[PDB]
Design a protein around this nucleic acid. Structure first.
Ligand code: ATP
Ligand code: CA
Ligand code: CA
Ligand code: CA
Ligand code: CA
Ligand code: CA
Ligand code: CA
Length: 903
DNA sequence: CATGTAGGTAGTCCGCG
DNA sequence: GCGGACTACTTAC
């Protein structure tokens, strides 16, 4: 096989690399790497190295990496550019793997682990590590085994061995319900003292040294706890055995009363699954406990146990250990679904970076671009210092707040990257400037044509047309991968709707799910077979299709994020190719594009409807337009339609066969105007929205910029079995909004859009009557606990103290002295409830760590003093008032002359 | 050590015979 | 109590 790296580190003048050799064996090696950097030299000097602007360079080959670094400083002091890759391990990877890396994940040791630490005196701080580690579960991907390390004897209790037999039993039979598919994969190892456990864990670690290390919160808890605990018991050099190169760095972040730390283990790539999840999932959760996320992702129940976690080992060691095992498995289950490790490996090896550097788009792109330029013997520029400077972004249209009955939306495929490719925006493709007119003059095609030689953006920049830029070149590659995967995702989505339609008429038979590839639209033959399948087989197929869609979503959305990240990095001062001329060339072009195409669409629709000056585009944001299709429907007359699907078909066809071609013509004209390199503004129909035919539903509404709701029947070619709400910005989409209020607001919206005012009023009335019976957590608001200390004046709120921070302070006073109450952690999420006047907490609100029940000591009083009236008013009624006044209807029947009668 | 800007809601403060 | 500045939190792109 082809060789590929696992990890790379620079330590002094040595590169330390772990890799897979040609026989698929894991190897390690130390290399005294001899780096090169470069300097401009005179034209006369014949060379094979040129900078990206074609200026000749001379290679400086160094004896060691220290000399290279030293040289960079001397050049800085002289005042001359020091070119080349200054992150030497990227150069090493580039020299060592001068080819497209094909890696085999089965050779990569991916470790997933989690530890337990009984602590009777509060949270067990990793920096102090003063309590025994009494359980570790460590899953190894190469062995496919869960290695369980169980402490039987501790100063907090001596316990019996854990029973795998009881673990496998159903919880309703007193077992722990450890999933049956991992029972045979568990290797259980009890220990009579902690030192032997830890010694054996280290020996185990040596034999099975993680390459990728993950788990839930491992970076902020498990890893620093294990490191510091081993350090305190055996000494630091023993602790350093967690690094295959025996080197670590201890990052101490000053949390103030007290503190915590991150440990860097050289030769390992730590990918904390919480960080992967936050970067790659595109969710905004109110809690990030493993219980919450597992139930969200997997629909599995919360791990239930009686009493506090500090007493679980002593009271029920059996359950303690099972839950340690299960917690580790749940991360594997989430990853089986989401495939973030696979994505990390894909992206890492594509870029030729340390795998943990996928968290940094700047590092990722720096490596991609360096490797691309190196292949052509070109030399990358020195990184420079720049002051932070705000710059303009997208255009968002001010909508008229209203109900909007029939709406069709369109937007640009991969807008900013397409702009980069169309205009040819790169550091080395800049050809000059032109004198800019006001943007509106370009939008209305009255400004002079910027150039008939170069490709232009309305920010004043000109670019070469006849040569490739490294930015366009490399952004196109990732874009094309993105496009591939989104096709797979959308096919699986369409495939899923077919299955949902068939589930309306399941067959009474015993059969199996069809063996199909869900990434491709089902053939007619497959669809015929599906119409005869049973419910059981159909439901299994739907699950598989949805998993295929999620996998495709992970792959496409994050490659989208990567290329959009390249456009943004051009406006980040730490990016090697930072340049506001290029950043603003993109955003300014985008502003012109949206407003140009608004004009063109209004012109076109007026023409075909035989009218003049009517406004068809009602809204747009960055690269999208929203078109009122009311006059389109009225032209033919609603009477002509047989059902909802018929008018949907009609608008679908109208957009495809009439509008999109008019849009393409409009954009081709814009392209000629800017004399761009390549026409790539492809604005395809997104949503088709309206009320069901014959209903009193309003179809949709806008309250303002970035705030609207649409009843959608077709989305990017997916014709839904059941209409789906597209809601943006409204309170239903906000993690700060209480969970049950999101639900109730969404149902208010559904009724408004699908059923009408009377339906809304009926629901509003019921919810108002039943509000007070909802579970307290379900109606608590959520917020992030930032800068708590800043407003903490003697345990009381300082000036300008935010509401949520005030609630945290109230909480801290209420739990003072109580050692079991969980502390609010700086930066983390909290539930928040308002409190009636005169409450025993002595303030207007309370807040506690999210994803948890509030400690039993104060829970009773919180429940007793909750202010339901404030809560209903602020979280539900006030947002609903916004929706309904915008839509021009009432959530409560207004008084009128009719009130005089008895109906 | 290092993607971007645009934009709405709701909080505190402060003015207000 | 209500409604402007000033701003934290948060989401749409
Ligand atoms: N997270 C982000 N970081 C930087 N720029 C972004 C981000 N999200 C959106 N943008 C900018 O807004 C543009 C339009 O956003 P949009 O969500 O329509 O995605 P897109 O890149 O056009 O891809 P799609 O083909 O899925 O529409 C992007 O091309 C850019
Ligand atoms: Ca635990
Ligand atoms: Ca788009
Ligand atoms: Ca699209
Ligand atoms: Ca059937
Ligand atoms: Ca868009
Ligand atoms: Ca109490």
């Amino acid at each position: 096989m082809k060789e590929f790296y696992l990890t790379v580190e620079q330590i002094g003048d040595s590169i330390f690399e772990r890799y897979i050799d040609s026989n698929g064996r894991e190897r390690t090696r130390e290399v005294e790497y001899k780096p090169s950097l470069f300097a401009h030299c005179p034209e006369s000097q014949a060379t094979k190295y040129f900078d990206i602007y074609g200026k000749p360079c001379t290679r400086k080959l160094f004896a060691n990496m220290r000399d290279a670094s030293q040289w960079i400083k001397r050049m800085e002091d002289i005042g001359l550019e020091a070119l080349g890759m200054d992150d030497f391990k990227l150069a090493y990877l580039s020299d060592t793997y001068n080819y497209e890396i094909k890696y085999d994940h089965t050779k990569i040791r991916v470790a997933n682990f989690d530890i337990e630490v009984t602590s009777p005196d509060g949270f067990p701080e990793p920096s102090q590590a003063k309590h025994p580690i009494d359980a570790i579960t460590h899953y190894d991907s190469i062995d496919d085994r869960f290695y369980v390390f169980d402490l039987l004897n501790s100063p907090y209790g001596n316990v019996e061995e854990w029973s795998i037999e009881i673990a496998a039993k159903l919880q309703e039979q007193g077992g722990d319900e450890v999933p049956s598919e991992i029972i045979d994969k568990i290797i259980y190892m009890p220990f009579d003292n902690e030192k032997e456990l830890l010694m054996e864990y280290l020996n185990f670690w040596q034999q099975k040294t993680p390459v990728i290390l993950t788990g839930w919160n491992v970076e902020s808890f498990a890893i620093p706890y294990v490191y510091n605990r081993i350090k305190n018991i055996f000494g630091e050099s023993t602790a350093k055995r967690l690094s295959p190169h025996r080197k670590t760095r201890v990052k101490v972040i000053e949390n103030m009363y007290g503190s915590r730390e991150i440990i860097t283990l050289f030769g390992i790539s730590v990918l904390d699954y919480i960080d992967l999840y936050k970067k790659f999932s595109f969710t905004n959760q109110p809690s990030y406990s493993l219980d919450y996320i597992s139930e969200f992702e997997l629909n599995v129940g919360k791990l239930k146990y009686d009493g506090p976690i500090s007493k679980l080992r002593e009271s029920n060691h059996q359950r303690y250990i099972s839950y340690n095992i299960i917690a580790v498995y749940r991360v594997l289950q989430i990853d089986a679904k989401r495939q973030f490790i696979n994505l990390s490996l894909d992206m890492g090896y594509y870029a030729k970076i340390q795998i943990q550097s996928v968290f940094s788009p700047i590092k990722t792109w720096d490596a991609i671009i360096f490797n691309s330029l190196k292949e052509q013997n070109k030399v990358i520029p020195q990184g420079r210092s720049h002051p932070v400077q705000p710059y303009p972004g997208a255009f968002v249209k001010e909508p008229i707040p209203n109900r909007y009955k029939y709406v069709m939306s369109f937007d640009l495929t991969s807008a900013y990257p397409s702009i980069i490719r169309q205009v040819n925006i790169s550091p080395e493709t800049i050809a000059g400037t032109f004198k800019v007119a006001p943007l509106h003059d370009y939008i209305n095609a009255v400004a002079e044509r910027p150039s008939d030689v170069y490709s232009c953006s309305p920010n004043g920049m000109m670019y070469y047309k006849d040569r490739d830029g490294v930015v366009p070149t490399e952004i196109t590659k990732v874009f094309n991968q993105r496009k591939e995967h989104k096709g797979y995702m959308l096919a699986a989505q369409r495939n899923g709707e077919i299955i949902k339609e068939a589930l309306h008429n399941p067959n009474l038979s015993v059969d199996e799910p069809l063996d199909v590839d869900y990434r491709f639209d089902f053939s007619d033959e497959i669809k015929e077979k599906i119409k005869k399948l049973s419910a059981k087989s159909l439901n299994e197929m739907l699950f598989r299709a949805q998993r295929t869609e999620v996998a495709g979503m992970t792959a496409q959305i994050n490659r989208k994020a990567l290329i959009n990240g390249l456009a943004g990095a051009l406006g980040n001062v730490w990016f090697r190719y930072y340049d506001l001329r290029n950043a603003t060339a993109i955003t300014t072009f985008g502003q012109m594009a949206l407003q140009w195409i608004e004009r063109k669409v209004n012109e076109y629709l007026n023409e075909v409807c035989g009218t003049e000056g009517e406004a068809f585009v009602l809204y747009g944001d960055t690269d999208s337009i929203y078109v009122s299709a009311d006059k389109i429907i009225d032209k033919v007359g609603e009477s002509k339609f047989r059902d909802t699907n018929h008018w949907v078909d009609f608008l679908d066809k109208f957009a495809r066969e009439r509008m999109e071609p008019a849009i393409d013509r409009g954009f081709r004209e814009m392209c000629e105007y800017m004399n761009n390199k390549q026409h790539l503004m492809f604005m395809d129909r997104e949503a088709i929205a309206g009320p069901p035919l014959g209903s009193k539903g309003i179809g949709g509404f806008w309250t303002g910029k970035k705030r609207y709701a649409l009843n959608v029947w077709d989305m990017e070619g997916t014709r839904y079995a059941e209409p789906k709400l597209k809601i943006m910005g409204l309170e239903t989409q906000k993690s700060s909004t209480p969970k049950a209020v999101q639900k109730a607001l969404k149902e208010c919206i559904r009724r408004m859009l699908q059923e009408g005012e009377e339906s809304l009023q009926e629901y509003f009335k019921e919810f108002e009557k039943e509000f007070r019976q909802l579970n307290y957590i379900s109606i608590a608001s959520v917020s992030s606990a930032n800068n708590i200390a800043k407003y903490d004046v003697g345990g009381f709120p300082g000036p300008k103290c935010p509401f949520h921070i005030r609630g945290i302070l109230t909480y801290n006073r209420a739990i003072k002295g109580n050692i079991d109450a969980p502390q609010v952690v700086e930066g983390e999420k909290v539930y928040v409830l308002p409190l009636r006047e005169g409450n025993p907490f002595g303030d207007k609100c309370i807040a506690w760590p999210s994803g948890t029940e509030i400690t039993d000591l104060i829970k009773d009083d919180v429940l007793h003093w909750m202010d339901y009236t404030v809560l209903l008013e602020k979280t539900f009624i006030k947002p609903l008032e916004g929706f309904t006044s915008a839509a021009k209807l009432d959530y409560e029947k207004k008084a009128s002359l009719f009130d005089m009668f008895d109906f």
